[PDB]
Design a binder for these strands. Structure first.
Ligand SMILES: [Zn+2]
Lengths: 129, 236, 50, 67, 52, 41, 40, 117
RNA sequence: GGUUUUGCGCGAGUGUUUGGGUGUAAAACCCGCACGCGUAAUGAAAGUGAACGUAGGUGAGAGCUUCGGCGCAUCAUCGACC
């Protein structure tokens, strides 16, 4: 688009970062992340630890799971596996449970810091409606 | 435990106070028995204090002098604690790499270059002590050129917890960019010395294995360029 | 920065230093500051009518 | 936090700003090299900065600011 | 200061927020070794010459 | 007291040298190719 | 009367389940290198 | 639901801080009158009647005669030392009776009584 | 009093401001117990009560990839359960 609808200065900083990455890098990962950052909140549904673990169950382990949303803890999930989760915002319970399980909680700026092209990444979205 | 009240004045905002704290740490490092008893936790606190001292250092020439002194402390520490000193330094650097803005980032990169060169010129005496070479190469294999993503600090028991520290791609790229310059400055790029040839061949095998095993395209490309530097014996 | 120096009654440093709390590293959000400020300024008002 | 302070100083308010109807905004800070409020020259958003100023005594000085 | 610490830990139901950006310096984020290495070649300059 | 050049500027200078070399090679190739293009047309 | 009794029992059971959920949430919330101590 | 004259029967709440400070001043005045005594009388622990709130307990109106006798506090003297007495309530359970007896005993152990004139 | 959309805070929880504490006093700060909506449904009702399959498969599908292959959300079909 032309301008982010959000009023968060840090979200606009992320928008500038991913505009630069999309323009100077051929990464479809960067392009889709930029579009999802431009997206509104209801178009960015929250993801759950149960969902990300169910997607992580297979050989996709040791891949950095990437979701542009709020990662919410799920009481139904009893055991949380080790994982590296990078998201816009983490709820306190979700972050605490990930850290207790031994995973790594990351921000999107450090995501671009480590792997600008989204190598070894696993993109997830939330449930629609 | 150890009583080390000078780290606070090391982090203090006055240059005279920081210099006095650095001289006190000089005396501390000279004290051999305490230096012999330096643990990993202790070296982690000292290197955190020095990290913040450099962070507070303002001007270019004072920064260069402070980095030189920080590199030169290694000859002051004893043999049984040099390995702990370097390991704590690189743990501190991996923990605080991402938090530095660019303006202090230049001087922290200069500090990293200086300490790497200091380790390489402490490798000296076969004209090169194999034990020192082994220690330095083990350090380079664990923190810089790691086949894994994280480093394990302390051991697991009822008397201790856990430190898992991830290695930054930025520090990896810097070491891949400065190891050639530092080996040239220290004098391992002389083709006459068979010991030097074996050491540089081992370093080349290390960075090559990193090239084939790494999963970061930036690391792959920069390792390829470092190997393609024309000053190496292979490409000459 | 880890610590901040304390200054005496004469304007010169006393020599003591104190650790800055994490509220000073907390994020800055001018939009939320704006919203709360308008809310509070409206919260101070007194009614008028004809 | 240079980007954050720049956003706060350009999008919300600036005590040194004098916006004109002639299409340019002026910066009142005494240490700004240019007389225009812009990202390149803002003494507050540019942590590392330099300026040239004249003393009353006819002497010219250059000023340096670092992070 | 010592009481700011105490009260901001004492407030129930509130925690010091975790920010969405770790390194606030966007200049650090862009002008860094890893990014500059991973970027591709530029397709032009800031000011483009007029062709015809 | 010489004020060493920043490491980032060293990296920039190496990258710029590589870019200049690439530009020179490409320019020479384009000159030659334009020559055969003119001949064939 | 049994209909009304089961309605009342269902309402009470819903309230009790909500109270137990709050208690479970309380239980779940119950379940040197640092700068503040190193530079204290 | 605006069929009637809510215009004539709308009443606002602009005096909320005023009523709050007035209530605080009223309880302060009661304290000034009963300077060493507590502001409120001791009340027993009772149980909520309905099934929805059985497991919860609250404060009652006044202590039972049997509870007062078991605690050893005379009926006629309890209100003078600040114990609410409810003649209507009945114990009906040793559990509640014992709970109120323990509460009254704690009140006795924490109470200091002055010798008349 | 309803409803759609944008932003913001928290998030399977959320809402201090009925009230109480406090105060530089209609401000600001604080919160003990409730309550409101939501986090399992269906049947007229008695009441019952959500896993046979990586919560299922097949095919697409953004994206990642050791180029061998992994596969978000969602859709169509064949399933499973209450
Ligand atoms: Zn300005």
């Amino acid at each position: 688009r032309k301008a982010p609808k959000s009023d968060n200065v840090y979200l606009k900083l992320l928008v500038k970062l991913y505009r630069f990455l999309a323009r100077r890098t051929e990464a479809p990962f960067n392009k889709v992340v930029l579009r999802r950052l431009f997206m509104s909140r209801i178009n960015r549904p929250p993801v759950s630890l149960s969902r990300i673990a169910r997607n992580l169950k297979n050989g996709n382990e040791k891949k950095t799971v990437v979701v542009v949303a709020t990662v919410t803890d799920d009481n139904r999930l009893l055991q949380v596996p080790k994982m590296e989760v990078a998201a816009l915002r983490f709820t306190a319970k979700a972050r605490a449970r990930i850290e207790a399980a031994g995973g790594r909680t990351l921000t999107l700026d450090q995501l671009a810091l480590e792997k600008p092209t989204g190598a070894n990444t696993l993109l997830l979205r939330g449930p629609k409606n | 435990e150890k009583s080390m009240p000078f780290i606070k004045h090391l982090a203090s905002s006055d240059r005279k106070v920081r210099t006095a704290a650095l001289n006190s740490l000089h005396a501390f490092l000279s004290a051999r028995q305490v230096a012999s008893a330096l643990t990993t936790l202790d070296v982690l606190k000292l290197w955190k204090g020095l990290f913040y001292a450099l962070w507070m250092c303002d001007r270019a020439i004072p920064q260069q002098n402070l980095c030189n002194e920080l590199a030169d402390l290694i000859w002051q520490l004893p043999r049984e604690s040099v390995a702990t000193w370097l390991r704590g330094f690189w743990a501190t650097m991996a923990r605080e790499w991402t938090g530095i803005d660019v303006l202090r980032m230049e001087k922290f990169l200069l500090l990293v270059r200086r300490v790497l060169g200091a380790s390489f010129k402490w490798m000296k005496k076969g004209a090169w002590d194999q034990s020192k070479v082994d220690e330095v190469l083990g350090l380079l294999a664990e923190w810089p050129f790691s086949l894994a993503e994280e480093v394990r600090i302390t051991q697991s028991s009822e008397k201790g917890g856990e430190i898992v520290q991830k290695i930054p791609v930025g520090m990896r790229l810097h070491v891949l960019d400065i190891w050639v310059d530092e080996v040239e400055r220290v004098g391992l790029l002389n083709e006459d010395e068979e010991e030097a040839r074996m050491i540089v061949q081992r370093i080349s095998d290390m960075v090559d294995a990193l090239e084939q095993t790494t999963k970061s395209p930036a690391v792959r490309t920069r390792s390829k360029d470092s190997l393609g530097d024309d000053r190496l014996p292979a490409n000459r | 920065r880890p610590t901040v120096t304390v200054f005496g009654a004469d304007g010169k440093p006393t020599g003591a230093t104190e650790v800055l709390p994490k509220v000073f590293s907390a994020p800055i959000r001018p939009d939320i500051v704006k919203h709360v400020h308008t809310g509070m300024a409206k919260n101070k008002r007194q009614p008028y009518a004809v | 936090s240079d980007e954050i302070v720049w956003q706060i100083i350009n999008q919300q308010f600036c005590a040194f700003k004098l916006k004109t109807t002639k299409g340019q905004n002026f910066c009142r800070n005494e240490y700004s090299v240019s007389g225009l409020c812009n990202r390149q020259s803002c003494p507050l958003a540019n942590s590392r900065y330099a300026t040239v100023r004249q003393s009353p005594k006819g002497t010219i000085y250059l000023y340096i600011k670092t992070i | 200061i010592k009481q700011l610490d105490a009260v901001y830990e004492s407030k129930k139901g509130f925690f010091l927020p975790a920010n969405i950006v770790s390194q606030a310096d966007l200049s650090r984020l862009i002008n860094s070794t890893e990014i500059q290495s991973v970027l591709r070649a530029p397709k032009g300059e800031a000011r483009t010459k007029r062709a015809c | 007291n010489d004020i060493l050049v920043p490491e980032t500027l060293l990296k920039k200078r190496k990258s710029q040298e590589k870019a200049r070399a690439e530009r020179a090679a490409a320019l020479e190739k384009r000159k030659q190719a334009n020559k055969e293009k003119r001949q064939v047309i | 009367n049994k209909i009304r009794a089961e309605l009342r029992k269902a309402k009470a059971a819903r309230h009790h389940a909500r109270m137990e959920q709050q208690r479970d949430l309380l239980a779940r919330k119950r379940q040197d290198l640092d700068t503040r101590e190193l530079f204290a | 639901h605006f069929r009637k004259h809510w215009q004539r029967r709308v009443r606002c709440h602009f005096d909320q801080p005023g009523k709050k400070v007035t209530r605080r001043l009223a309880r302060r005045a009661k304290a000034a009158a009963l300077a060493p005594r507590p502001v409120d009388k001791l009340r027993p622990i009772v149980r909520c009647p309905t099934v929805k709130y059985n497991r919860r307990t609250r404060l009652g109106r006044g202590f039972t005669l049997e509870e007062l006798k078991a605690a050893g506090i005379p009926r006629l003297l309890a209100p003078t030392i600040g114990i609410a007495v409810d003649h209507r309530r009945k114990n009906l359970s040793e559990e509640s009776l014992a709970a109120n007896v323990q509460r009254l005993k704690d009140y006795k152990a924490r109470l200091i009584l002055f010798p008349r004139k």
